[PDB]
Design a protein around this motif. Structure first.
Motif, mmCIF file in Angstrom:
data_model
loop_
_atom_site.group_PDB
_atom_site.id
_atom_site.type_symbol
_atom_site.label_atom_id
_atom_site.label_comp_id
_atom_site.label_asym_id
_atom_site.label_seq_id
_atom_site.Cartn_x
_atom_site.Cartn_y
_atom_site.Cartn_z
ATOM 1 N N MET A 193 37.522 -5.269 -66.023
ATOM 2 C CA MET A 193 38.975 -5.285 -65.988
ATOM 3 C C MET A 193 39.590 -4.919 -67.331
ATOM 4 O O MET A 193 40.809 -5.018 -67.493
ATOM 5 N N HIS A 194 38.782 -4.543 -68.312
ATOM 6 C CA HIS A 194 39.305 -4.062 -69.594
ATOM 7 C C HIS A 194 38.631 -2.729 -69.902
ATOM 8 O O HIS A 194 37.560 -2.680 -70.511
ATOM 9 N N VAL A 195 39.280 -1.647 -69.510
ATOM 10 C CA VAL A 195 38.740 -0.306 -69.694
ATOM 11 C C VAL A 195 39.215 0.266 -71.019
ATOM 12 O O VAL A 195 40.277 -0.077 -71.536
ATOM 13 N N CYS A 198 43.524 -6.126 -72.127
ATOM 14 C CA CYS A 198 43.676 -5.138 -71.074
ATOM 15 C C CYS A 198 43.997 -3.794 -71.705
ATOM 16 O O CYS A 198 44.343 -3.709 -72.889
ATOM 17 N N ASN A 199 43.893 -2.740 -70.895
ATOM 18 C CA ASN A 199 44.375 -1.422 -71.282
ATOM 19 C C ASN A 199 45.821 -1.268 -70.830
ATOM 20 O O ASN A 199 46.168 -1.608 -69.697
ATOM 21 N N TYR A 248 45.766 0.190 -62.920
ATOM 22 C CA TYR A 248 45.895 -0.453 -61.621
ATOM 23 C C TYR A 248 47.311 -0.940 -61.371
ATOM 24 O O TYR A 248 48.009 -0.397 -60.501
ATOM 25 N N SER A 255 44.474 -0.900 -76.217
ATOM 26 C CA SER A 255 44.001 -2.217 -75.819
ATOM 27 C C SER A 255 44.893 -3.271 -76.456
ATOM 28 O O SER A 255 45.223 -3.169 -77.639
ATOM 29 N N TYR A 297 40.439 -1.719 -56.397
ATOM 30 C CA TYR A 297 40.090 -1.474 -57.792
ATOM 31 C C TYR A 297 38.647 -1.018 -57.930
ATOM 32 O O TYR A 297 38.383 0.050 -58.491
ATOM 33 N N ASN A 316 45.461 -1.505 -66.940
ATOM 34 C CA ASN A 316 44.123 -1.330 -66.376
ATOM 35 C C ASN A 316 44.099 -0.242 -65.300
ATOM 36 O O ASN A 316 43.301 -0.302 -64.362
ATOM 37 N N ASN A 360 33.004 -7.243 -68.163
ATOM 38 C CA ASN A 360 34.463 -7.274 -68.066
ATOM 39 C C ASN A 360 34.988 -5.920 -67.613
ATOM 40 O O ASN A 360 35.601 -5.171 -68.388
ATOM 41 N N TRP A 400 33.629 0.495 -70.251
ATOM 42 C CA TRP A 400 33.950 -0.930 -70.281
ATOM 43 C C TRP A 400 32.655 -1.709 -70.481
ATOM 44 O O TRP A 400 31.563 -1.228 -70.155
#
Lengths: 105, 100, 105, 105
Positions: free
Chosen positions: A53-55, D40-41, D92, D62, B87, D90, A51, A47
């Motif tokens: 939060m965007h993998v 996001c993923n 998550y 993505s 997370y 993500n 950011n 990433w």
């Protein structure tokens, strides 16, 4: 170690303005019937450091013999930008994070 | 730095045969709602049996979290980490309790 | 059942302007690295629906006998606010989500 | 709605002895001011129900525009075997699980 799962992360290499070679190793995944009985998914995730939060998934594989390496050349990176990456096992265990910065273009 | 979230983990202290003082810090959390901070530990041999030593919400940073964990086994290795919002995770820290 | 882990979630009850009673059950947990059933962490986690990353711990327990119930009264909630919660095992397995809204007064 | 993330999961279709079509949709993903255009993923993960610790990544993409569909035909499955899948954002947020069993023939 006394832990059943050990994961190493390597420094990024072949760092250009827009790409890098990232890698790690699941050094240990001790087998027992059940949750530890079929090997594991190993994923190499990266990433932009700004950011997290965007993998992106560079590589995802199943292995049942250890040590097991995982690697990829990641491309289309932004120049002069900091990235982080890690190796995960079963999307539960994580290596330490590794960081690098792409060159200016 | 460029990362919006940074988390430090501290070495365990006050290590006895059955207890230790464990702690860490969310040193950066760019945003005020704040975030959940959880301090988690386990026997190193059994990393899928986690225990929550402390779980708090904070909105001003850096923000510490700490606890004395007790009823540990003697001469046994434990690990712990701090997580934000379930997370982000700090690096792992390891210690071993004293012998009786 | 084929699955080693089964988790049920109950609707929130005793909803007030600032609290609620939330609960669920781990009906099955079959796992061991040896010959005897291992324990697990069971947690009840909740959040404001509008801010689902700010996940808080209502209860966290260790159990090795199943079915295992978990419950908690969560307090200091905000009036007329929507919340969700779930039960987790080892912070890996999750029940389905439940949703409720605190009272206005 | 109040929830900034909505993930729908569809029942598996086109189930054969060795394949199925699995899919879902991220119907809402509210982005933050500072991460507009980032995304996001979205991943579609599946596993044998008996072994939920070891998943395979059927699709990982993505996306920055929503609603966003994701799908895969998963193949070379074991006959008469129960599988589960979910859509995760993500790695998550997660949809509810779906479950299905491959045909014997």
């Amino acid at each position: 170690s006394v832990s059943p799962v050990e994961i190493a992360i390597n420094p990024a290499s072949e760092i250009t303005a827009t790409s890098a070679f990232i890698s790690g190793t699941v050094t240990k995944f001790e087998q027992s019937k059940g949750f530890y009985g079929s090997g594991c998914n190993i994923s190499l995730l990266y990433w932009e450091a700004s950011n997290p939060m965007h993998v992106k998934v560079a590589s995802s594989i199943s292995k049942k013999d250890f040590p097991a390496d995982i690697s990829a050349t990641i491309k289309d990176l932004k120049p002069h930008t900091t990235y982080q990456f890690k190796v995960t096992v079963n999307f539960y265990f994580s290596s330490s994070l590794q960081t690098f910065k792409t060159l200016a273009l």
